[PDB]
Structures are given as structure tokens and as C-alpha cells.
Amino acid sequence: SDVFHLGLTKNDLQGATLAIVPGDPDRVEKIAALMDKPVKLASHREFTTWRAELDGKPVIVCSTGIGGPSTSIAVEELAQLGIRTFLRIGTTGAIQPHINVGDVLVTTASVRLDGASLHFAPLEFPAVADFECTTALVEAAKSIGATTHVGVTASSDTFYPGQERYDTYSGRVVRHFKGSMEEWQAMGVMNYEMESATLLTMCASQGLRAGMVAGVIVNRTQQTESHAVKIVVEAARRLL
Amino acid sequence: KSDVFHLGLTKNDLQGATLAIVPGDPDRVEKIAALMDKPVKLASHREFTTWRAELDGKPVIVCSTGIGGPSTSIAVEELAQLGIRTFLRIGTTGAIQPHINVGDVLVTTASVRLDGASLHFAPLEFPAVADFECTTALVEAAKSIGATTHVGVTASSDTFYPGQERYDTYSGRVVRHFKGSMEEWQAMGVMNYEMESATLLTMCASQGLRAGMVAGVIVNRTQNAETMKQTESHAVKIVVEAARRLL
Amino acid sequence: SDVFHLGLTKNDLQGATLAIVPGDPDRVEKIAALMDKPVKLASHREFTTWRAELDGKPVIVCSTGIGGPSTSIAVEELAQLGIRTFLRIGTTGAIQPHINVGDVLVTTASVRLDGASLHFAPLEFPAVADFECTTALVEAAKSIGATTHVGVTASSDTFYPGQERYDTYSGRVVRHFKGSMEEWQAMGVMNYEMESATLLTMCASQGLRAGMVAGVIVNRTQESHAVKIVVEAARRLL
Amino acid sequence: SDVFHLGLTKNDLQGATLAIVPGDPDRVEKIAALMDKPVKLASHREFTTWRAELDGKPVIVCSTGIGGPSTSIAVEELAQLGIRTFLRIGTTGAIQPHINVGDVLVTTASVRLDGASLHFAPLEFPAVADFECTTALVEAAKSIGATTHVGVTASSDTFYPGQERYDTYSGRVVRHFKGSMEEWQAMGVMNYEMESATLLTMCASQGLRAGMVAGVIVNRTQKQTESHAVKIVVEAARRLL
Amino acid sequence: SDVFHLGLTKNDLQGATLAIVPGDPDRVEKIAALMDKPVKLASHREFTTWRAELDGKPVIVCSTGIGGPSTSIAVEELAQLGIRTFLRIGTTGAIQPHINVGDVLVTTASVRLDGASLHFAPLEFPAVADFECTTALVEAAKSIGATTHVGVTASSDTFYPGQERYDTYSGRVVRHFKGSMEEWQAMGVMNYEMESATLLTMCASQGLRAGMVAGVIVNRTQTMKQTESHAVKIVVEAARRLL
Amino acid sequence: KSDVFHLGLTKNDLQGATLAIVPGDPDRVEKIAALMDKPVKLASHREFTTWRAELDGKPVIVCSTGIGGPSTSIAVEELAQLGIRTFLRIGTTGAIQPHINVGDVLVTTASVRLDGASLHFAPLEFPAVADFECTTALVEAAKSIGATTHVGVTASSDTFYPGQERYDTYSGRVVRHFKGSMEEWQAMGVMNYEMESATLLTMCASQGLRAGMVAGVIVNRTQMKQTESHAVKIVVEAARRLL
Ligand SMILES: O=c1[nH]cc(F)c(=O)[nH]1
Ligand SMILES: O=c1[nH]cc(F)c(=O)[nH]1
Ligand SMILES: O=c1[nH]cc(F)c(=O)[nH]1
Ligand SMILES: O=c1[nH]cc(F)c(=O)[nH]1
Ligand SMILES: O=c1[nH]cc(F)c(=O)[nH]1
Ligand SMILES: O=c1[nH]cc(F)c(=O)[nH]1
Ligand SMILES: OC[C@H]1OC=C(O)[C@@H]1O
Ligand SMILES: OC[C@H]1OC=C(O)[C@@H]1O
Ligand SMILES: OC[C@H]1OC=C(O)[C@@H]1O
Ligand SMILES: OC[C@H]1OC=C(O)[C@@H]1O
Ligand SMILES: OC[C@H]1OC=C(O)[C@@H]1O
Ligand SMILES: OC[C@H]1OC=C(O)[C@@H]1O
């Protein structure tokens, strides 16, 4: 391995410069199977990596695991191996009543409720997505006629208190996060997830292109995975 | 007289307008409105000069913000009260990347929040991000007139001098927090410095208002008073063209 | 001109070292008229500059516009041109019940609810007024017999949510500022305005003298006068 | 399942109240193998769970994945299912010259260079290990005669800039982290790893017991002994039943 | 004197490397009196110092006064004079219902509600007690059979608003501290006192060993002389085990 | 036996005093009181020594705060409960400007808040500003005795050592946050370092109490009994003007 965690060398990538990065290791082969000549390259910890061919060009699919820290490792090591464009495809809970389960969300920038982003840029730096990547994702979405919303996402280091869930062992939330969901809702934030603040900040601050799409699996105020996967693959096609 | 405390405007004055172009300089307001049909001066108090005009048969506002987040926040708030829902900022900027030339046009996707006013609308972790439709329109508009365009992140400072790490000043020094900061933003790919976008983008993105940001490069902090006029005009045509796409 | 924004040269100031700095560019000529030999020097953006004379000495009057950011430009550029003493004269909203519209407020120091002050000194540094400047303002106010209150001011980068106004487009205020007015009230803070934290910090941290006086125009519970005091204080500071 | 991620029911644990929590899903079976009647319960995302038996008492082995966020999910959901004691066994880079590759480190408390801990307690709250767990880990280490150091650990949300590595794509480190390693060294900090701040803070602030032990696999100033750290954590678990 | 505040020379310590550090200058003699050959060395400001002998070895007793700032001077200056181990013995208010007046609390680590700790290490660094010291205190407590609790302590730069007391001149508490006591209670914090965050941080970040024990003199949800005596016996016995 | 928890004073003991001079050092209390009429010791507990005396026929209090914001905050709170409304701190300080000489007296208009206790009264953005009348009284008093006097900003630290960027210590290092800090304060015109004013000024200005601050310079970082006496004469004269 050329890198500490992924168990990959630059030769393994066959010159690929674009990666699709789902959170779940099990989703990797599913994404790769939509493309040509899919092959498994490696699997270590939460990092499962497949290579495939899109319009004759090699593309990588690599899982990040849950959270900014594991995401930061995958992105950095892929960047060392030559990846320059990163498309995250995820699952999220919507926090707006007009967003329905099954819809797709394209993130322009994220509320940084994570710690890893701070390791790349101070808090005042925006966790903003690459304009070309966002454009490609929005177009891909419309391309298959998915119901699409574009806007801000809250990206949390936690699934529970950081997303103001009380269905927990302790049944309480630290002061800092009390009333936070209502605040983000009032500010128009679409959804919660757990990797975008780290991904977008680390790429935007290092000259790497990143974009973010997710299928809504729940709505906190009130099939889809395959929809979102089709979209991220089609967006990749436009960025090759 | 007015339905708002600072701008001296009534809702009837806007005649149903829902989009506003907001330059920083009061003197650029007439310049912008003239590019459009039926310009008429509405009001002028403090740093806020407001003209109405017409675009493809649609009423549009041009209103100056003055320098800085705090005067910007007043203008944006009061226009929103009067019914404005889309704000397009047209400004001047100092570039900090060598590959960016005077005369180029910058479209901001999002801003580093080196301001105080953004914090009155959202905590620091919230991104000072531009609306996607507005940014798209600005980028499409710049390509329409064939300007040299860069799209990316801008640092938005509450100060012209120490916050942009200028040392050619009365004290000649910069507080610890900002020492070495220009080099940091440069390394992080930041295109330029200006003084209003963090406030504008944060206050709009957190209140359901659409906002975009374009600026003409008038200096490069790594590398003509006449060019400053040509660049301005280049940037002005772009924001008007973008406006037409957002009606 | 010797400076980027103000459109002034050092010779323009004619040796002046004291400036009176209103927020409103429209108030400049008004203030300068109270003194001798008033003449317009320049007007660009929110920056209108007149020169005048007080007891035979040249003095500047220059608008800052609204907010710390434009204030920081004006002060820096005036300092480059030789100004050493800055007297702000402003308008304010009182937040104590006992303070009446028409009263005059002299600021000893400000709560830093601004961004620009941080570009000169970290938050722990006090946005404190110069002692001589404050003295002259308080004596001038007792001189003409205005009802004066002396104390701490909250200086905000916003007119609306940072002063906890709810009469707005959104009708809401970000968590950080909910209940803030009541908090400043309990701490004995007199008023809100929008430039003093930046002015006082930038001057106190660079060896410049600054003072701050304002006229109450609203009471969050319930000009010619303030201007008169600021002019008389200037005389005492020449 | 009774929980959103781990795919486990309370019945699956069979009354277990203690869990050993490695970072790596592939280490789970190895740990369970040291005990009696090991059986695999589930595997979803980076969460692999086995159950085994220690002195005839049921115990859980469940991987956290890398980082505070996935750790926070594992700990929370395990707590919902009845777990009250958590013992992390990890790998680490030592940052003191006197500490040798292969040594075992027991963490009394962590420097909080993570984000998830803040979702449980404000920064001023200490990321401190439970006294009984720490005592059990030290005694176990003593028991098997391993070279052991006891002290403070730096727990980072990143492997790279948060541990002030410059051998990277960008080759630079954000201002906040420049000179940080030398600072922790001067302050006697033993090592870096990536989950303890979240684990210790979330447990200490919710009445759950947690301890942390790790095998040194690199020395930033300078055979993995994973198996060495593993025997100690199992022996410590025995003392905590 | 070899130091700026304590009025002590290295020779005064007679080779001592352990100090017991009460907050109250008046408690110093009481503690020393439990030991052999107690002798008064100096008294300046809030810093009263005695020397004594514990199992034949010289030990120091030195008051810190109230608060991290004076504590930081005493610990620094004692370190210059050769002290490497610091055991604080204090008085505290319990904030858990199950903890009674007269109980003894041993602190594993502290919530840093102080300013002085920040002068030694950034806030993310834990105000954690030395493991050997904590162990000695817990074993000493069991030895004399006191009702003992072991855990986290909130260490505040104020006695009043920082401990959310409203029985005060102003009757109010600044926003940051409103609702704070209930938050610490929910997080299992045992008690409030005013010196441990500074002590534990400054020691843990400089290779010095520190421990912290206190007697409960009030319960904030629900004798003082006796309590003081119990805690003093424990800190002395712990010191014996750390020689 | 006491109306307050730490000071050991009842309100009747104050005999209607509404002003207190508050030195840091308990041992300076009697000295200050001896400048006035009918001085009597009231109490001594911990670092809090209190005397009462008479100035121009009016009762006045002298009460030591100990070193640091935390003990200061206790003294001020409990004195305020006892009826004190005006507080004049008299301290010793290290100058950090070349033009300020040893023996000079400094009047503080406001302080840099390098402390923790001030945060327990007001958030950091609130100014640790002195009362205008007290400052005026101190400046006039200083002119009255013809001391060499400077008026300005003071840096108020929770530590004597790393917070004042001293390297003459056991560990010989300073945490990143304070590296290069002294040069920065100097550049900003800060006059001096001491350890109680940020807490005193903040807690007073935010609770309707009057506070002023004067100190004698006993060291200059860039370049003591008599100096003490000079500042003491000034604080007593300022007190006369504030009765
Ligand atoms: O981070 C999240 N992922 C998926 C969800 F459904 C959710 O609510 N939060
Ligand atoms: O804020 C700025 N506006 C314009 C400039 F040229 C510049 O450098 N900075
Ligand atoms: O900044 C302000 N100026 C004037 C006012 F009346 C007010 O309330 N706030
Ligand atoms: O987090 C870490 N784990 C393992 C290492 F070797 C290291 O350096 N850092
Ligand atoms: O700091 C404290 N010491 C003693 C107490 F009783 C208390 O409540 N708080
Ligand atoms: O806090 C201080 N008091 C006295 C001094 F001389 C000094 O330098 N610092
Ligand atoms: O279930 C939690 C996961 O879904 C969304 C994310 O971002 C998390 O990884
Ligand atoms: O000259 C400063 C102005 O130019 C750019 C900005 O943003 C400021 O308004
Ligand atoms: O209305 C806003 C103006 O009034 C008071 C201030 O300080 C602002 O400049
Ligand atoms: O390789 C990174 C892993 O090692 C130590 C940790 O804490 C991480 O999980
Ligand atoms: O009463 C105040 C004292 O008690 C506990 C502490 O830590 C203080 O020194
Ligand atoms: O020696 C320390 C003392 O001097 C100045 C202060 O404020 C401290 O109390």
C-alpha cells in the first residue's frame, strides 16, 4: 500500500481522478455495478474500494464510513493517489415539512457541526461545495426526473444529540444543542447528515472538487438509495 | 415618507419589485439603473441611494449598501420588508491569487466570515453561501459577455486594512489573529478580499432570501484608475444580465 | 489624494489633529457650521469631510457612515493624515427606563458586539474611551446643563437582531442574542449604537484619543444638543 | 433490532453489561476468540458485534470504526441495550521518545481534539476515564508484565493535520495545529489516537464507566503487540464484571 | 528568599519533595500538627508554610489561598524549591442528593470553570489528577473508613455566580451560568470548589503529580470543624503512601 | 457571628461605611488604616483582613482581597452585601512600557481581561472599565501629592508567571496562547500587569458598584516599600474626595 489505511497503490487506480464516496461499505459494489468492468480493489476497516469504467475512463468508488474522521482519512489517502474530484452519495433525514421521503437533496454548503473540518480550516471558512460538482449533480437529478431540493445541510459529528434526538439512553441534550433543530429549521436548513462538513471543507480548502447528494430516508417533521446512486453516477459522467 | 426607518422608501415605490441589485458605492446606483429601462431616483439618505428601473417589463430596485456588513444588513433588512426576495451584490475586490488579473470578474460561491454582522443572523458554523440559482445566473451572464471569470471562495473582512493584512498603515502592525492570514487564505484557494459578502450571504441564506455576489478585480495583492472604470462597467453589465435571468 | 477612500491630502487638513466624527454624512456640514471658517473638503461614498476652525485652530469634521467597517477606514485614513483625537457624536437608543429621549449619553467604554474591533485587538481588550476625551465631554455637558448619563454602551454590528428588535422581516433573533437586551439592562448598560466599539478599540490600541457622545432618540422600554456638547468638548481638547 | 445501526436486540446480549470496543471490525473476532462460547451477532457498516463469555458472564465485543462519530453511535446504542462499562482497546502513535513501539498505554484522560465530545459536554468538562476501569487496566497490565505507561492521550478527529503530519497531499497544517505536537510533547502527553475523547466524555457525563488502553504501533520521534493489548483488556474486563 | 512570594529558601525545605496544600492559611498548622517536628517557616499574604516530618521524611504544608491565581503562585514557587507532588485538601459544596455533609470527595478530574488553567494549557486539555495520587487518597479514605465518593468536580473562579448562587447582592447570574448547576448535576459532577482545575491542569501539564480531596460542608440540594478534621487525616495518610 | 460566609463581619460592624479601600496583601491593611482616624481591626479570616477607620469624620473600610480574581470576587460580593458601594483597589504592579519608571503610579481606566472570574459576571465583550468618578478622584489625588502618574489600560492576569509571559519558572515555558503576548500588549499601549483589576472592574461595572484602581510600579519588565507608601497616600486622598 502507498497509503496507511486504504491498502491501495497509485497503480491500482489506473489513472482515475474522480471518486464516488458513499458512507456505507456495502453500498460500494452496488455503485460500481452500474458501471463497466467493476473490480474490487481492497477492503480494510470501513474502507471498501472498487474500480470501474465510466465512458471508458477509470473511476473509483470508496466508502468513507460514518463521520468526518474516517471521511478525512479516505479523502486524504485518495488525494495522495491522484483523486481530484469527490462525489459523496448519502442518506439523510429532512427537517423541512415540504421535503418528502424519497426526494433527493443537493448540498451547496454545510453547517459545520463537526470537529474534523476545523483541522483543515478555521470555523469562519465555508464548508461549500464545488460549483461544477453541484451543477452536475443538479443536472443529473433532473436528468432522471427526481424531485430535487438544493440548499444548506447541517453536518453533525453525532447521530443523536447533535441532531437533537431525545430517543436516547440519557434522554437529554447538552445546552449548546437544546433548541438547535428549530434554529436550523427556521434558517432553511434542509437536512442532517454526518460527513459533508468535513468533506466539503477539506476539499474546498485544498483545491479539490467535491459535491454532495443524498436521498431522504426520513422526515423529522412529518428504491430511494437506487435513485440517488443513479444520480451520482450520472453526475460523475458529466465531470469526467 | 417611508415604511422603513433608514431607506426612506414605501412599498408602493417598489411597484411590486422583488429583485434588487446592491452595489456598495452610492454613486454606482445611477450607473446601474441607466442600463435598464425607465430608471427613476427613489431616495437618498446616508449611504443608501435607491433607484427603481425596469427589466424586460419588470420593476427592479438598485440600492446601495455602503461599506461593510452593518450598513449592508440595514439595507437588506429594509428592502426585504418592502418585498425584495433576491439580492445581487456587485462590488470591487482585491485579488490574492497570482493567476487572477485586474479586470477579471469573480463570482463568489461562499465567503470566509471575517465580519461581525453575519454572527447576528447565524452562528459562525453556518456557511455564508450564495444561492445556487443566483450564482448560476452570474456565471452564465459572465460567459455571455465573455469576461475572464473565476468562481470560488472570497474572504469578507470587517476592515480594509488589518483584516486584509495591509501593513502600509498608521501603526504598521497587524494584530496576532491576522498575522500571516493572507498567506493562509491564499493556500486555501481563496480568490479575493472584500467587505460585504459574508454579511449579505449569511443573512440571506438563513432567512429564505436569494443572494449572489459578483465583483470586478481592481487590484492584485501579489502583482490604473482608468481600468477601475472599465472593470466596474464590465461587472455592472454582468449583474444586470444575471438579473434578467432571475426575473 | 494621500489616502485611498477619503479623497484628502495632508495639506487639506491644514495641520489639524482633532476630528469630530458623526455617522451621518449629512450631519457634517451642520456641525462644521457651528465653528469658524467651515469649508467642504471632499465627499466620496459615506465619507464627507469638512474643515473648520475652533479658537483659531483647524479641526476636521468627517462622517464614518454606519458601522465599524466604514468607521475603521475613516479613522485609519484620518490618522495617516495626522489626526490624533477623535470625537464621535451619534444617535442612540436608550435601554434604561430612567433615560429620556433628549438626554445625552457619554460612553466610558463599550460592549464589543462588533467585528471590526477584533481586527485591532482580541476581545479581552477593553473598548475604553480616552480619559481626557471623556472628561471634556462630561464637563461640556455639565457646562450647558444637559441631562447627561455616563456609562457603558452596547455597540452592535446590526441595527435589528443585535439590538434584539423583533419588528422585522423574519420576526426572530438568533439564539446568541435572545434575551440580550435584558441582560445588558441588568448590567447597567445605557444604550445601543453601532460604531463606538470599533472606534474606541482601534484608538485605545494604537495610541489615538477617542471620546463618544450621543443623543437619545428612542427608549427601547418607554441632535443639536449632542452636537453642541461635542463642539464644546473639542475646544477643551485643543 | 432494537437499535438504528448495530442490528442487535436486548435479547442478543443475554444480560451483558460490559463491552470491549476496538476500532477495527476485523479485531472483534480475535478478541472474542480469547473468551468462552464466542458467537457473531451482527455486522453492519463499521459495527461488527460478537458475544462471548468471561468467567461464565456474558460480554460484548463491538467495533466502533474510526472516529468519535461512529464511536458515539456504537456507545449510545450499546447503552440502550444495557451496556454500562466500556473498554476501548486501540492502536496509537506514541509521541514521547521514552515510549517504545510495542508498549501499552493506559489513558487517564484525553485532550479533546474532536468534535463529538462537544455534543455531550462543553469543552471545559474533562475527558476522564473511570477510576475503577483505569485501575483494572493497570493491574491487568501489571499481571501480564507488559511495559506500561499511564497518562494523558491526545484524541484527534484527524489522522493527518490534527496529529501534525506534513507528509500529505497539501503538505501543510492549519494555523491552529501548527506547533501543536511539540506542545503536547512538552505537556507530557503520551500519544495520539482518534476515539478516546468522545468515548471518555460521553461516558463520564452519563454515568457510564469507560477505560482506554492501546498498543503503540508507531513512535513519531523514532510484530504489532495488538495481541499484547488484547490480553490486558480481556483481563481487565474480568476484574470489572 | 529564593522565590518572589513564599518567603522561602531551598534549604528551608530540607529536601522535601511533597507538599500538602490547603486553601486556608489557618489550616496549615492543624495539618502539620498531625506530623512530627512541625515548624513554621513563613507567612506572607495568603501563603503560610510549615515544615514537618512524615515517617522520617521532610514534607511541606503550604496554603494556596482561595482561587487558581494564588494557587498558581504557591505551586510554581514550591516547584522551583523542589516540590514534585501536591495534595490539595479542601472544603466543598456537594451538588448530588446522595452525597452528605461530612462525606469525603476524591476528584479524578475537574470541570475547568477557572481562568488560571488556561495559562498552562488550552481548554481541551483535561484537568486530570495523577493516578498514583488519586489511588493513595482513595486507599487512605477506605483505611480510616470515611464515606467516600470518587469522580468529577466543578472548579469555579467564583464562589457565587459560578456556583449558581442567587442569594447575593445582585440576585442574578450571568447567562452563561444560568442553569449550569443542574447541567453539571445531570452529568454526574459531585461538587463545587475553587482551586482544583488550576492545580490539576498546571501539574498534569508540567510533569508534577497532584491529587485532590475535600470534605463536604454543604449540600446545595439539601460539623464543619469535624469534617475538616476527617479530610485532614486522609490527606496526611495519603501523603505517607506517596513518599 | 457574621452576616457573610468568608469575611466574618456583620453590617453593624461597618458603622455605615459605604467605601472600602481594597489592597491585595492582608498585611497592608493595618498600614493603610493607620493613615486615618480611630483605626480598629474588625476581623481576619483567610486572606481577608478588615479594618475600620474614619476619614473626615466618616467611617471607611480597608479590606484585603488576597491575590487573584476569585478571592477578590468573594471580598467585593460580601462587602457589597455589607453595604459597600465604592471600591478603590490599591496594588503593586510591573510596568511593561519603557517610559514608565519604578516608583511611578498608574491609574487604570480599564483592563485587559486575562482572568476567569470576570466571565462569571459578564461575557468577554463587556468592558472591564473603571468608574469615571473614582478614576477622576484617583487622578486628581495623584496630582495632589505630585506623583509621576500614567493613566491607561492595564493587563489583568490570573497568573503571575505564564500569563505575564515570564519564563523564569520551573518549566521555563509559556503556553502557545501567551507566547509573544507581552510584546503585543506593549504595542497596544498597555501600561502594566497585575492580577485583580479585570475581576474587580467587571464585577463592579456590571452590578452598579463604583470601582477605581491605582498601583505603584515596583518593577519594569523592559528596563518597593516607599513606592507602596506613595500609592497608599494617593488612594486615601482619592477616598476623601469620594465620601
Ligand atoms: O445523519 C442522519 N442520517 C440519516 C437520517 F435519517 C438522519 O436522520 N440523520
Ligand atoms: O475590500 C476590498 N475592496 C477593494 C479592494 F481592491 C481590496 O483590496 N479590498
Ligand atoms: O444604533 C442605534 N441608533 C439609533 C437608535 F435609535 C437605536 O435604537 N440604535
Ligand atoms: O491515531 C493514530 N493511530 C495510530 C497511529 F500510529 C497514529 O500515529 N495515530
Ligand atoms: O467552593 C466552595 N467551597 C465550599 C462550599 F461549601 C461551596 O459550596 N463551594
Ligand atoms: O502582577 C504583578 N504584580 C507585581 C509585579 F511586579 C508584576 O510584575 N506583576
Ligand atoms: O445513519 C447515519 C448515517 O446516515 C447519514 C450520515 O451522514 C451518517 O453516516
Ligand atoms: O474600498 C473598499 C470597498 O471595496 C470592496 C468592498 O467590499 C468595500 O466596500
Ligand atoms: O441608525 C443607525 C445609526 O444610529 C446610531 C448608530 O450608531 C448608527 O450609525
Ligand atoms: O489508524 C487510525 C486508528 O488508530 C488509532 C485510532 O484511534 C484510529 O481508529
Ligand atoms: O469557601 C471557598 C473555598 O472552599 C472551596 C474552595 O476551593 C475555596 O477555596
Ligand atoms: O505579586 C502579585 C500581586 O501584585 C499585583 C497583583 O495584582 C497581585 O496581587
Tab-separated table of N, CA, C and O and ligand atoms in Angstrom, chain A residues 23-24 27 64-67 88 90-93 155-156 159 163 165 192-196 212 214 217, chain D residues 4-5 45-46 73, ligand 7:
chain	number	residue	atom	x	y	z
A	23	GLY	N	-21.099	6.467	2.258
A	23	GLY	CA	-20.738	6.244	3.653
A	23	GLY	C	-20.635	4.766	4.000
A	23	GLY	O	-19.762	4.344	4.778
A	24	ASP	N	-21.523	3.973	3.412
A	24	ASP	CA	-21.640	2.556	3.759
A	24	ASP	C	-20.797	1.676	2.845
A	24	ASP	O	-20.980	1.682	1.623
A	27	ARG	N	-22.476	-0.327	0.175
A	27	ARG	CA	-23.050	0.356	-0.969
A	27	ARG	C	-22.051	0.438	-2.125
A	27	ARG	O	-22.427	0.755	-3.252
A	64	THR	N	-16.496	5.792	3.029
A	64	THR	CA	-15.846	6.673	3.996
A	64	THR	C	-16.021	6.202	5.423
A	64	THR	O	-15.291	6.630	6.319
A	65	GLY	N	-17.018	5.353	5.635
A	65	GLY	CA	-17.512	5.088	6.976
A	65	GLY	C	-18.350	6.252	7.473
A	65	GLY	O	-18.537	7.248	6.766
A	66	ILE	N	-18.862	6.130	8.696
A	66	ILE	CA	-19.626	7.207	9.298
A	66	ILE	C	-18.701	8.241	9.934
A	66	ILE	O	-17.805	7.886	10.692
A	67	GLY	N	-18.894	9.513	9.592
A	67	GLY	CA	-18.247	10.595	10.314
A	67	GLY	C	-17.071	11.266	9.619
A	67	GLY	O	-16.411	10.667	8.779
A	88	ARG	N	-19.832	12.734	-2.875
A	88	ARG	CA	-20.451	11.962	-1.801
A	88	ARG	C	-21.902	11.665	-2.143
A	88	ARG	O	-22.628	12.544	-2.607
A	90	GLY	N	-25.159	9.951	-0.160
A	90	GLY	CA	-25.529	9.592	1.205
A	90	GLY	C	-27.007	9.363	1.481
A	90	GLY	O	-27.827	9.337	0.559
A	91	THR	N	-27.328	9.161	2.766
A	91	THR	CA	-28.707	9.108	3.266
A	91	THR	C	-28.876	10.220	4.284
A	91	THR	O	-27.922	10.570	4.986
A	92	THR	N	-30.074	10.790	4.379
A	92	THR	CA	-30.293	11.892	5.316
A	92	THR	C	-31.705	11.917	5.871
A	92	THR	O	-32.617	11.319	5.315
A	93	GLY	N	-31.874	12.636	6.968
A	93	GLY	CA	-33.203	12.951	7.460
A	93	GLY	C	-33.516	14.402	7.164
A	93	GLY	O	-32.762	15.300	7.566
A	155	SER	N	-24.294	19.341	9.234
A	155	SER	CA	-23.461	18.145	9.226
A	155	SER	C	-22.876	17.952	10.607
A	155	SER	O	-22.091	18.787	11.064
A	156	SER	N	-23.289	16.864	11.257
A	156	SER	CA	-23.098	16.646	12.693
A	156	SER	C	-22.153	15.493	12.992
A	156	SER	O	-22.211	14.439	12.360
A	159	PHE	N	-25.098	11.320	15.586
A	159	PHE	CA	-26.409	10.936	15.081
A	159	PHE	C	-27.519	11.377	16.047
A	159	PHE	O	-28.629	11.738	15.629
A	163	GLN	N	-28.145	16.047	16.449
A	163	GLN	CA	-29.315	16.183	15.589
A	163	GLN	C	-30.550	16.359	16.478
A	163	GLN	O	-31.691	16.122	16.054
A	165	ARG	N	-31.815	14.600	18.924
A	165	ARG	CA	-32.631	13.430	19.227
A	165	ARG	C	-32.644	13.219	20.729
A	165	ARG	O	-31.595	13.308	21.383
A	192	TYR	N	-30.149	16.806	8.049
A	192	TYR	CA	-28.964	16.425	8.801
A	192	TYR	C	-28.271	15.234	8.152
A	192	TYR	O	-28.928	14.278	7.697
A	193	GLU	N	-26.940	15.274	8.146
A	193	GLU	CA	-26.142	14.086	7.892
A	193	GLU	C	-24.805	14.245	8.626
A	193	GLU	O	-24.670	15.161	9.443
A	194	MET	N	-23.833	13.371	8.357
A	194	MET	CA	-22.657	13.295	9.238
A	194	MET	C	-21.270	13.381	8.597
A	194	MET	O	-20.275	13.244	9.306
A	195	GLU	N	-21.190	13.607	7.286
A	195	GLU	CA	-19.868	13.657	6.622
A	195	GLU	C	-19.564	14.905	5.785
A	195	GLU	O	-18.392	15.186	5.504
A	196	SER	N	-20.589	15.635	5.356
A	196	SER	CA	-20.388	16.722	4.379
A	196	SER	C	-19.557	17.910	4.873
A	196	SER	O	-18.759	18.467	4.112
A	212	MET	N	-22.119	16.905	-3.136
A	212	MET	CA	-22.841	16.120	-2.157
A	212	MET	C	-24.307	15.936	-2.562
A	212	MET	O	-25.032	16.916	-2.770
A	214	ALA	N	-27.878	13.324	-1.552
A	214	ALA	CA	-28.414	12.349	-0.606
A	214	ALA	C	-29.901	12.101	-0.848
A	214	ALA	O	-30.634	13.017	-1.225
A	217	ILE	N	-34.468	9.589	3.682
A	217	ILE	CA	-34.984	8.308	4.164
A	217	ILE	C	-35.962	8.514	5.311
A	217	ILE	O	-36.738	7.622	5.649
D	4	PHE	N	-30.956	1.573	15.881
D	4	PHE	CA	-30.918	2.025	14.489
D	4	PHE	C	-29.740	1.509	13.639
D	4	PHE	O	-29.901	1.320	12.429
D	5	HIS	N	-28.571	1.284	14.245
D	5	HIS	CA	-27.377	0.923	13.461
D	5	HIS	C	-26.803	-0.464	13.719
D	5	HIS	O	-26.373	-1.137	12.788
D	45	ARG	N	-22.314	-1.745	8.519
D	45	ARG	CA	-21.342	-0.664	8.404
D	45	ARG	C	-20.053	-1.069	9.153
D	45	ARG	O	-19.616	-2.220	9.041
D	46	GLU	N	-19.453	-0.159	9.920
D	46	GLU	CA	-18.200	-0.485	10.620
D	46	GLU	C	-18.443	-1.134	11.978
D	46	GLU	O	-17.513	-1.279	12.772
D	73	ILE	N	-22.129	6.483	18.064
D	73	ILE	CA	-23.287	5.672	17.713
D	73	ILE	C	-23.207	4.320	18.411
D	73	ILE	O	-24.177	3.887	19.036
G	7	LIG	O1	-27.247	6.771	9.787
G	7	LIG	C1	-26.227	7.760	9.894
G	7	LIG	C2	-25.593	7.965	8.527
G	7	LIG	O2	-26.567	8.476	7.604
G	7	LIG	C3	-26.239	9.824	7.199
G	7	LIG	C4	-24.980	10.032	7.584
G	7	LIG	O3	-24.240	11.013	7.100
G	7	LIG	C5	-24.490	9.012	8.567
G	7	LIG	O4	-23.281	8.428	8.073
